[PDB]
Amino acid sequence: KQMNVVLIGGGTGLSVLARGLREFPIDITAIVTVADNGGSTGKIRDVMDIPAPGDIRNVIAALSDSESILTQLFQYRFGENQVDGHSLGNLVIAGMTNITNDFGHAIKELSKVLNIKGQVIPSTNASVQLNAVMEDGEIVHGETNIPKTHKKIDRVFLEPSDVEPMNEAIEALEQADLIVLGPGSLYTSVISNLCVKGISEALLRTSAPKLYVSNVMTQPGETDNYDVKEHIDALTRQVGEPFIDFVICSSESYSKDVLQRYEEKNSKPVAVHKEQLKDSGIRVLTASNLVEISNEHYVRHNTKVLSKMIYELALELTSTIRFTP
Amino acid sequence: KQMNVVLIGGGTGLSVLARGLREFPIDITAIVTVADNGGSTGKIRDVMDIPAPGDIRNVIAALSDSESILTQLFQYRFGENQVDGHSLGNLVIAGMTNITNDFGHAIKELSKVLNIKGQVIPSTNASVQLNAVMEDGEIVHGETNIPKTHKKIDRVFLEPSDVEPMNEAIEALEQADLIVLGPGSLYTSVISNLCVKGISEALLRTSAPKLYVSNVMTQPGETDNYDVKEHIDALTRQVGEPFIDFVICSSESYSKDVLQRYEEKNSKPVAVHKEQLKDSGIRVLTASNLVEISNEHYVRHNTKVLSKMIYELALELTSTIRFTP
């Protein structure tokens, strides 16, 4: 009965969006990058050879009952003075992986124990690192160093590169009503999944339409000076052919104070250029309240609005049409 | 409807027995010592000020489904090369305790999440250490050092000594059909609970009968040369008045090879002296197969037999009697 939406990403963009979509009658599948090597995750991957648990942990938690004892434990973190400030959920994922000898199977077992509504699937079961080639040709190693340089990223890639997707991710892409990429860091959260060759191939094979959710602001070290089309072109480069049908973005202008706050952090609004996009056959979707703005001049997506737009798009794509039989 | 048996102890004696009793129609309450400071537990109590999680963890696990994912995680231990060889269950108890700011409440929440049948209750909610006074008057500090000396223990005591029992332990003692002490290390596993003054007072107040399950062999550093009556007298000393009604033990003689194996480990069978016990008003209970003996000449309790004896005693104590109205 329910519609199937597949989210591809990583980070708080994905976990916040997944929780927002939980408010609608849709079966959510999230395909989540396992390449990070910093913070919580880096602490555990130094200890043991395991794919990154952190982004996946947050997405599992987003699809579960946040008030539950088990979700509270899963999202608990020790202070730096206890157990090296580990995430207890990451430790549980690690233990589960030692038990199953299989990260993907550990994620399946834990998802069931946490009684989530949806599914969360690693982009790959393999232990990988994300690397970048800079515009000048410099190679940067590890997800943590990629934005902490100061050059244009030309491309990102995985080491080892020969890695396979999970069967369940491919099946979800094949059978989706709608596939959503982003919002999140373009290279480290979104494209990092597309670096898994079988995921990119599935995207091109499937007739499910693909939506990109644009970032509000450019991201220092990943997307400096990118307009919306440049973000899409980076996706296209990785995948091999154009494939995005829809983009959610706002072409609103921001107050002097907002622009100032983001200039100080070396960040500007992502420019839309809606005519260029329509010429490329990409449909632009917006709403007047897509973006929320704090009293301190920070901006973010309004989760309720973004979620509803996604659900309403899936609904429209699955609706009756006009033809004569 | 079901009968209520309360077990007081700590260690593998208790966890094995609790699991054995799970085979019968009885509501099990286990009151478990929280004073240990060695191994798994010591690793966590060095990190954080928390009562000992380890004995309690094992008893919770004994009352749960061992094949379950959650019980498997709870009983998982990292190798020494990962997370300092911590018990994942201990880490979860620690995190839960940080969340609730209350060890007893953390144990209640975790018991429910693990879907146990029964209840497990700490002897106290306070952080304590177990100390011993030796026969010569030497004071030894911490549960780990107590057997690792080489003198008769005169008594054990808690630091701080002013600690309170949990309300649920007291209620269970008041309403029990039968209360079982042991099997386990006499001082460090059994008497350590009785050092909580309110537990000893409840034992004397209640009309529920009390059973002591004797150790098969004397324990080096705790009960060298103790016959059964000396074990009971140590309990009596702590509590203040005689209170044991029944004792389960075997007065079988062992093969030369068994005696040899235990002599090498400075250990002999605990002598019964059944006439002395009957003169003290203590009823002795045995069975021909109470003790199992390995091909390598080790001995242990037959769990099935011991469990059934306990259940059958509760049954007899709750049965109809003869009177004229």
XYZ file of C-alpha atoms in Angstrom:
650
model
C 0.000 0.000 0.000
C 2.401 2.778 1.267
C 4.757 4.748 -0.909
C 8.451 3.979 -0.934
C 10.934 6.850 -0.579
C 14.616 6.211 -0.615
C 16.966 8.753 0.976
C 20.683 8.744 0.123
C 22.999 10.760 2.350
C 24.688 10.980 5.687
C 24.834 13.395 8.586
C 22.283 15.490 10.409
C 20.595 16.466 7.177
C 19.563 12.881 6.645
C 18.742 12.014 10.274
C 16.594 15.169 10.724
C 14.847 14.560 7.399
C 14.237 10.888 8.124
C 12.609 11.784 11.434
C 10.532 14.450 9.649
C 9.285 11.959 7.064
C 8.256 9.582 9.836
C 5.286 12.018 10.216
C 3.816 10.687 6.855
C 2.425 7.378 5.456
C 5.603 6.329 3.681
C 8.001 3.433 3.874
C 11.407 5.021 4.345
C 14.659 3.464 3.172
C 17.867 5.350 3.974
C 21.143 4.482 2.255
C 23.865 5.865 4.498
C 27.547 6.481 3.954
C 29.964 4.386 6.016
C 33.209 6.164 5.097
C 33.701 8.707 7.906
C 36.730 8.479 10.099
C 36.382 11.490 12.518
C 34.843 12.082 16.007
C 32.688 9.350 17.673
C 33.149 7.159 14.616
C 36.825 7.705 14.214
C 37.251 6.725 17.874
C 35.716 3.344 17.144
C 37.292 2.756 13.710
C 40.767 3.327 15.235
C 39.946 0.572 17.760
C 38.617 -1.936 15.184
C 38.300 -2.549 11.454
C 34.626 -1.732 10.958
C 32.689 0.513 8.595
C 31.695 3.890 10.168
C 28.798 3.371 12.664
C 27.926 7.008 13.470
C 25.812 8.303 10.557
C 23.946 4.977 10.435
C 23.382 5.021 14.204
C 21.723 8.476 13.985
C 19.517 7.421 11.103
C 18.414 4.237 12.891
C 17.621 6.368 15.927
C 15.590 8.813 13.709
C 13.320 5.986 12.583
C 12.738 4.679 16.138
C 10.887 6.006 19.195
C 13.157 8.653 20.682
C 11.533 8.395 24.132
C 12.313 4.636 24.402
C 14.924 3.336 26.816
C 16.723 1.515 24.004
C 16.943 4.585 21.746
C 18.121 6.669 24.700
C 20.933 4.175 25.318
C 21.789 3.948 21.653
C 22.159 7.768 21.464
C 24.005 8.092 24.781
C 27.612 9.313 24.840
C 30.092 9.019 27.672
C 31.878 12.196 28.789
C 35.510 12.461 27.686
C 36.586 11.252 31.129
C 34.761 7.864 30.772
C 35.400 5.205 28.151
C 37.262 7.812 25.974
C 34.062 9.666 25.421
C 32.662 6.825 23.225
C 29.142 6.705 21.857
C 27.416 3.785 23.576
C 25.463 3.054 20.354
C 28.711 2.816 18.407
C 30.042 0.373 20.994
C 26.882 -1.698 20.648
C 27.204 -1.670 16.856
C 30.854 -2.747 17.251
C 29.927 -5.615 19.626
C 27.097 -6.697 17.360
C 29.522 -6.703 14.400
C 32.005 -8.857 16.363
C 29.124 -11.227 17.075
C 27.798 -11.474 13.496
C 31.174 -10.982 11.717
C 29.087 -8.846 9.290
C 28.333 -5.135 9.645
C 25.235 -5.189 7.376
C 23.721 -8.097 9.331
C 24.543 -6.287 12.642
C 22.653 -3.232 11.375
C 19.641 -5.421 10.448
C 19.598 -7.108 13.886
C 19.883 -3.769 15.728
C 17.212 -2.105 13.562
C 14.815 -4.881 14.559
C 15.698 -4.707 18.285
C 15.107 -0.899 18.159
C 11.757 -1.497 16.465
C 12.360 1.079 13.732
C 9.802 1.913 11.077
C 11.741 1.815 7.848
C 15.123 0.463 6.966
C 18.610 1.769 7.133
C 21.202 0.281 4.838
C 24.915 0.903 4.619
C 26.177 2.144 1.221
C 28.545 -0.803 1.464
C 29.425 -3.555 3.865
C 33.182 -2.974 3.285
C 35.584 -0.937 5.382
C 36.430 2.093 3.230
C 37.999 5.530 3.427
C 36.922 8.559 1.433
C 39.664 10.443 -0.387
C 39.591 13.583 -2.567
C 41.451 14.809 -5.620
C 41.850 18.607 -5.442
C 41.605 20.985 -8.444
C 45.428 21.231 -8.512
C 45.708 17.396 -8.450
C 46.640 16.915 -4.786
C 45.271 13.771 -3.157
C 43.791 14.118 0.336
C 43.227 11.047 2.495
C 40.276 10.457 4.796
C 36.936 12.157 5.183
C 38.236 14.337 8.050
C 40.949 15.993 5.871
C 38.787 16.529 2.790
C 37.136 19.829 3.845
C 40.114 20.878 6.020
C 42.283 21.818 3.052
C 41.493 24.909 0.993
C 41.132 23.920 -2.644
C 38.304 23.032 -4.983
C 37.466 19.347 -4.773
C 37.637 17.875 -8.287
C 36.253 14.492 -7.200
C 35.978 12.107 -4.288
C 36.684 8.414 -4.328
C 36.734 5.392 -2.103
C 39.671 3.249 -1.045
C 39.333 0.352 -1.788
C 37.303 1.393 -4.808
C 36.100 -2.113 -5.802
C 33.324 -2.224 -3.174
C 29.806 -3.647 -3.573
C 26.453 -2.188 -2.454
C 24.050 -4.122 -0.210
C 21.386 -6.091 -2.102
C 18.644 -4.372 -0.136
C 19.823 -0.912 -1.297
C 19.661 -1.945 -4.895
C 16.206 -3.485 -4.488
C 14.986 -0.280 -2.776
C 16.291 1.868 -5.662
C 14.652 -0.432 -8.221
C 11.280 -0.326 -6.470
C 11.195 3.230 -5.182
C 8.438 5.712 -5.961
C 10.911 8.499 -5.281
C 14.632 8.761 -4.544
C 15.945 11.746 -2.576
C 19.579 12.832 -2.516
C 20.526 15.181 0.255
C 20.378 17.517 1.987
C 23.910 17.162 3.397
C 27.493 17.865 2.534
C 27.698 17.341 -1.170
C 30.925 15.313 -1.318
C 31.276 13.765 2.070
C 27.639 12.941 2.758
C 25.972 12.487 -0.649
C 28.543 11.692 -3.336
C 30.386 9.359 -1.034
C 27.423 6.910 -1.460
C 27.476 7.367 -5.246
C 31.159 6.331 -5.222
C 29.836 2.810 -4.692
C 29.556 1.863 -8.347
C 26.476 -0.390 -7.965
C 24.525 2.487 -6.329
C 25.265 4.841 -9.216
C 24.383 2.087 -11.720
C 21.057 1.443 -9.936
C 20.261 5.161 -10.050
C 20.672 5.171 -13.814
C 18.781 1.890 -14.311
C 15.703 2.707 -12.268
C 12.754 4.635 -13.595
C 12.056 5.983 -10.115
C 12.484 9.733 -10.261
C 15.325 11.453 -8.421
C 15.144 14.592 -6.320
C 18.086 16.600 -5.091
C 17.518 18.700 -1.970
C 19.859 21.681 -2.225
C 21.822 23.108 0.648
C 20.780 26.572 1.717
C 24.395 27.784 1.971
C 27.688 26.865 0.308
C 29.956 24.709 2.469
C 33.508 25.824 3.161
C 35.940 23.242 1.743
C 33.311 21.361 -0.311
C 31.090 23.686 -2.380
C 32.513 27.254 -2.244
C 30.876 29.356 -5.006
C 28.650 26.464 -6.256
C 25.241 27.459 -7.564
C 22.530 24.713 -7.569
C 23.499 23.504 -11.076
C 27.120 22.963 -10.013
C 25.957 20.773 -7.128
C 23.897 18.740 -9.584
C 26.778 18.598 -12.071
C 29.012 17.079 -9.349
C 26.379 14.365 -8.846
C 26.217 13.848 -12.622
C 29.978 13.570 -12.870
C 30.090 10.763 -10.301
C 27.136 8.830 -11.645
C 28.109 9.293 -15.330
C 24.932 10.710 -16.932
C 22.341 13.343 -15.973
C 19.741 11.772 -13.719
C 18.213 14.420 -11.386
C 14.629 15.306 -12.349
C 13.684 17.645 -9.478
C 15.434 20.060 -7.139
C 14.127 21.603 -3.932
C 15.668 24.978 -3.245
C 14.867 28.572 -2.276
C 15.778 31.643 -4.384
C 14.858 34.005 -1.577
C 17.321 36.756 -0.743
C 18.491 36.938 2.888
C 18.884 39.849 5.323
C 22.179 41.738 5.618
C 22.706 40.073 9.014
C 22.285 36.528 7.659
C 24.652 37.196 4.756
C 27.151 38.716 7.239
C 27.008 35.726 9.592
C 27.732 33.315 6.727
C 30.406 35.545 5.071
C 32.331 35.383 8.379
C 32.202 31.548 8.070
C 33.192 31.821 4.354
C 29.742 30.795 3.097
C 27.107 32.374 0.814
C 23.587 31.371 -0.272
C 23.519 28.732 -2.975
C 22.346 30.601 -6.098
C 19.410 29.068 -7.929
C 19.400 30.426 -11.514
C 16.024 28.798 -12.180
C 16.082 29.390 -15.950
C 19.362 27.477 -16.446
C 17.846 24.588 -14.472
C 14.612 24.503 -16.535
C 16.735 24.544 -19.710
C 18.465 21.387 -18.391
C 15.061 19.776 -17.934
C 15.163 20.032 -14.115
C 11.997 21.028 -12.292
C 12.472 23.441 -9.390
C 10.307 23.038 -6.287
C 10.075 25.637 -3.528
C 7.803 27.006 -0.789
C 7.746 30.389 0.935
C 8.692 28.848 4.361
C 11.205 26.197 3.231
C 13.925 28.014 5.187
C 13.799 28.963 8.894
C 15.973 31.814 10.211
C 17.024 32.224 13.835
C 17.169 35.387 15.926
C 20.981 34.936 15.814
C 20.856 34.959 11.952
C 21.513 31.232 11.328
C 19.452 29.466 8.639
C 18.216 25.923 8.259
C 15.567 23.935 6.458
C 12.134 23.939 8.003
C 11.817 20.158 8.493
C 8.045 20.125 8.529
C 7.863 21.994 5.208
C 10.612 20.009 3.509
C 9.113 16.722 4.650
C 5.643 17.655 3.440
C 7.063 18.739 0.048
C 8.757 15.359 -0.380
C 5.645 13.455 0.589
C 3.504 15.656 -1.693
C 5.876 15.094 -4.617
C 5.695 11.274 -4.122
C 1.941 11.610 -3.980
C 1.803 13.634 -7.252
C 4.163 11.240 -9.032
C 1.925 8.326 -8.029
C -1.412 10.108 -8.843
C -3.855 9.514 -11.704
C -3.140 11.288 -15.009
C -5.043 12.296 -18.146
C -5.216 9.990 -21.109
C -7.805 8.722 -23.586
C -7.826 4.840 -23.659
C -0.704 -17.775 42.252
C 3.045 -18.716 41.861
C 5.438 -19.267 44.713
C 7.981 -16.634 45.625
C 11.612 -17.679 46.141
C 14.213 -15.163 47.072
C 17.876 -15.908 46.336
C 20.636 -13.964 48.112
C 24.152 -14.237 46.715
C 26.483 -13.257 43.950
C 28.644 -14.982 41.379
C 28.193 -17.973 39.129
C 26.534 -19.950 41.885
C 23.639 -17.538 41.858
C 23.444 -16.975 38.084
C 23.535 -20.744 37.341
C 20.952 -21.429 40.049
C 18.670 -18.621 38.913
C 18.696 -19.996 35.375
C 18.006 -23.488 36.766
C 15.001 -22.268 38.746
C 13.606 -20.615 35.628
C 12.632 -24.230 34.688
C 9.874 -24.162 37.446
C 6.615 -22.242 38.183
C 8.146 -19.786 40.629
C 8.560 -16.049 40.836
C 12.270 -15.511 41.378
C 13.740 -12.544 43.223
C 17.537 -12.338 43.418
C 19.257 -9.976 45.848
C 22.762 -9.499 44.492
C 25.910 -8.075 46.008
C 27.250 -4.856 44.481
C 30.576 -4.672 46.336
C 33.062 -6.325 43.950
C 35.932 -4.334 42.597
C 37.895 -6.863 40.408
C 37.874 -7.921 36.697
C 35.100 -6.661 34.330
C 33.506 -4.809 37.225
C 36.648 -3.318 38.597
C 37.401 -1.986 35.106
C 34.161 -0.031 35.155
C 34.227 1.047 38.823
C 37.715 2.556 38.290
C 36.221 4.620 35.435
C 33.142 5.811 37.383
C 31.600 5.869 40.849
C 28.964 3.167 40.447
C 28.013 0.059 42.399
C 29.437 -3.190 40.887
C 27.473 -4.124 37.699
C 28.939 -7.583 36.978
C 27.193 -10.031 39.341
C 23.872 -8.255 38.725
C 24.411 -8.307 34.953
C 24.884 -12.116 35.002
C 21.805 -12.640 37.132
C 19.665 -10.425 34.882
C 20.955 -12.408 31.917
C 20.072 -15.723 33.720
C 16.439 -14.659 34.006
C 16.180 -13.604 30.331
C 16.193 -15.480 27.013
C 19.822 -16.364 26.365
C 19.265 -16.758 22.604
C 17.936 -13.164 22.257
C 19.952 -10.481 20.502
C 19.693 -8.200 23.533
C 20.943 -10.830 26.000
C 23.769 -11.718 23.616
C 24.842 -8.064 23.550
C 24.466 -7.693 27.284
C 26.771 -10.714 27.854
C 29.279 -9.736 25.157
C 32.846 -8.814 26.119
C 35.405 -7.015 24.004
C 38.836 -8.633 23.630
C 41.610 -6.984 25.645
C 42.706 -5.126 22.511
C 39.325 -3.294 22.127
C 37.733 -0.920 24.613
C 40.073 -2.271 27.388
C 38.362 -5.593 27.241
C 35.145 -4.131 28.780
C 31.904 -6.031 29.185
C 29.387 -4.379 26.862
C 26.599 -5.064 29.410
C 28.578 -3.264 32.101
C 28.995 -0.299 29.762
C 25.255 -0.290 29.127
C 24.555 -0.430 32.865
C 27.006 2.469 33.338
C 25.326 4.559 30.592
C 21.891 3.768 31.966
C 23.075 4.853 35.440
C 24.410 8.148 34.020
C 21.005 8.639 32.413
C 18.890 7.858 35.503
C 21.407 9.127 38.121
C 20.259 6.025 40.087
C 21.744 2.532 39.837
C 18.647 0.734 41.223
C 16.367 2.509 38.728
C 18.851 1.687 35.888
C 18.654 -1.991 36.858
C 14.821 -1.848 36.810
C 14.760 -0.191 33.357
C 17.260 -2.699 31.912
C 15.456 -5.699 33.441
C 12.293 -4.585 31.652
C 14.052 -3.969 28.302
C 15.596 -7.493 28.564
C 12.150 -8.925 29.291
C 13.320 -10.971 32.276
C 11.035 -13.253 34.241
C 11.710 -12.373 37.843
C 13.470 -9.484 39.457
C 17.014 -8.690 40.291
C 17.705 -6.222 43.053
C 20.964 -4.760 44.265
C 21.772 -5.383 47.957
C 22.149 -1.616 48.105
C 21.989 1.352 45.806
C 25.168 2.843 47.374
C 28.731 2.588 46.126
C 30.489 0.336 48.649
C 33.650 -1.688 49.125
C 33.906 -4.962 51.002
C 36.653 -5.206 53.603
C 37.727 -8.047 55.926
C 39.097 -8.308 59.438
C 41.508 -11.266 59.661
C 41.821 -13.624 62.673
C 45.005 -11.777 63.738
C 43.180 -8.403 63.456
C 44.609 -7.217 60.128
C 42.235 -5.191 57.967
C 42.130 -6.012 54.248
C 40.577 -3.573 51.788
C 38.483 -4.491 48.768
C 36.816 -7.687 47.669
C 39.769 -8.596 45.407
C 42.280 -8.691 48.330
C 40.043 -10.542 50.784
C 40.765 -14.119 49.597
C 44.279 -13.229 48.346
C 45.764 -13.076 51.835
C 46.266 -16.254 53.852
C 44.511 -15.897 57.188
C 41.163 -16.854 58.648
C 38.559 -14.197 57.948
C 37.002 -13.140 61.265
C 34.349 -10.963 59.603
C 33.591 -8.887 56.544
C 32.158 -5.411 56.480
C 31.142 -2.677 54.118
C 32.616 0.783 53.688
C 30.594 2.975 54.094
C 28.750 0.777 56.564
C 25.641 2.995 56.943
C 24.029 1.795 53.691
C 20.336 1.064 53.063
C 18.718 -1.881 51.237
C 16.323 -1.380 48.310
C 12.640 -1.308 49.298
C 11.869 -4.076 46.832
C 14.381 -6.434 48.518
C 12.772 -5.930 51.864
C 9.274 -6.468 50.468
C 10.461 -9.682 48.751
C 11.924 -11.003 52.031
C 8.713 -10.152 53.899
C 6.513 -11.923 51.356
C 8.691 -14.854 50.365
C 7.614 -18.481 50.599
C 11.274 -19.435 50.792
C 14.591 -17.594 51.057
C 17.758 -19.241 49.726
C 21.274 -18.191 50.684
C 24.011 -19.439 48.437
C 25.594 -21.346 46.910
C 28.600 -19.038 46.431
C 31.632 -17.765 48.236
C 30.564 -17.498 51.816
C 32.024 -14.070 52.632
C 32.341 -12.323 49.339
C 29.156 -13.537 47.680
C 26.698 -14.315 50.500
C 27.644 -12.469 53.687
C 28.458 -9.343 51.763
C 24.652 -8.916 51.226
C 23.968 -9.561 54.922
C 26.372 -6.706 55.765
C 23.551 -4.425 54.644
C 21.878 -4.061 58.021
C 18.291 -3.800 56.690
C 18.694 -7.139 54.834
C 19.815 -8.937 57.986
C 16.981 -7.294 59.960
C 14.423 -8.408 57.340
C 15.757 -11.964 57.530
C 15.127 -12.040 61.263
C 11.715 -10.343 61.005
C 10.209 -12.530 58.309
C 8.540 -15.838 58.978
C 9.599 -17.078 55.551
C 11.924 -20.005 56.088
C 15.602 -19.778 55.176
C 17.687 -22.348 53.346
C 21.445 -22.354 53.071
C 22.921 -24.182 50.080
C 26.339 -25.443 51.154
C 29.421 -25.363 48.999
C 30.725 -28.748 47.968
C 34.344 -27.799 48.744
C 36.065 -25.382 51.120
C 37.278 -22.186 49.455
C 40.907 -21.155 49.785
C 41.105 -17.788 51.577
C 37.454 -17.783 52.737
C 36.393 -21.089 54.339
C 39.492 -23.305 54.847
C 38.602 -26.163 57.249
C 34.936 -25.030 57.660
C 32.401 -27.802 58.122
C 28.745 -26.958 57.220
C 27.972 -25.691 60.756
C 30.859 -23.205 60.620
C 29.486 -21.773 57.373
C 26.108 -21.365 59.055
C 27.706 -19.884 62.179
C 29.379 -17.198 60.014
C 25.933 -16.300 58.645
C 24.555 -16.243 62.202
C 27.361 -14.003 63.385
C 26.598 -11.391 60.724
C 22.842 -11.463 61.112
C 22.927 -11.610 64.948
C 20.728 -14.632 65.785
C 20.314 -18.164 64.398
C 17.959 -18.073 61.439
C 18.757 -20.939 59.002
C 16.111 -23.687 59.077
C 17.349 -25.938 56.248
C 20.654 -26.842 54.629
C 21.259 -28.595 51.322
C 24.490 -30.544 51.315
C 26.031 -33.917 50.451
C 27.876 -36.165 52.951
C 29.130 -38.428 50.191
C 32.802 -39.346 50.231
C 34.771 -38.590 47.046
C 37.279 -40.634 45.025
C 41.016 -40.421 45.730
C 41.414 -38.480 42.467
C 38.820 -35.837 43.392
C 40.334 -35.345 46.847
C 43.795 -35.084 45.213
C 42.673 -32.472 42.680
C 41.220 -30.278 45.442
C 44.143 -30.836 47.894
C 46.449 -29.410 45.189
C 44.201 -26.285 45.159
C 44.189 -26.267 49.015
C 40.545 -27.360 49.261
C 38.695 -30.278 50.906
C 35.051 -31.416 50.972
C 32.882 -29.446 53.356
C 32.146 -31.885 56.208
C 28.493 -32.320 57.101
C 28.298 -33.740 60.657
C 24.540 -34.243 60.307
C 23.938 -34.998 63.999
C 25.413 -31.664 65.173
C 23.147 -29.905 62.660
C 19.977 -31.734 63.812
C 20.888 -30.868 67.419
C 20.914 -27.186 66.349
C 17.432 -27.632 64.912
C 18.632 -27.500 61.278
C 17.095 -29.901 58.786
C 19.520 -31.448 56.296
C 18.362 -32.038 52.721
C 20.284 -34.131 50.202
C 19.900 -36.294 47.086
C 22.119 -39.030 45.669
C 22.927 -36.965 42.492
C 23.227 -33.474 44.023
C 26.890 -33.384 42.975
C 28.251 -33.964 39.444
C 31.869 -35.085 38.952
C 33.864 -34.585 35.762
C 36.220 -37.001 34.027
C 39.007 -34.578 35.078
C 37.929 -34.961 38.769
C 36.288 -31.528 39.253
C 32.993 -31.362 41.179
C 29.996 -29.083 40.957
C 26.336 -28.980 41.860
C 23.980 -30.714 39.490
C 21.815 -27.674 38.647
C 18.780 -29.675 37.642
C 18.788 -31.597 40.938
C 19.489 -28.581 43.128
C 16.809 -26.542 41.393
C 14.216 -29.286 41.739
C 15.069 -29.692 45.455
C 14.498 -25.975 46.043
C 11.224 -25.980 44.165
C 10.105 -29.155 45.983
C 10.956 -27.630 49.365
C 8.880 -24.484 48.550
C 6.085 -26.776 47.475
C 6.225 -28.800 50.747
C 6.373 -25.657 52.885
C 3.265 -24.340 51.120
C 1.338 -27.695 51.185
C -1.677 -28.732 53.269
C -0.996 -30.089 56.772
C -2.785 -32.199 59.384
C -4.926 -30.586 62.017
C -8.323 -31.106 63.643
C -10.449 -27.865 63.410
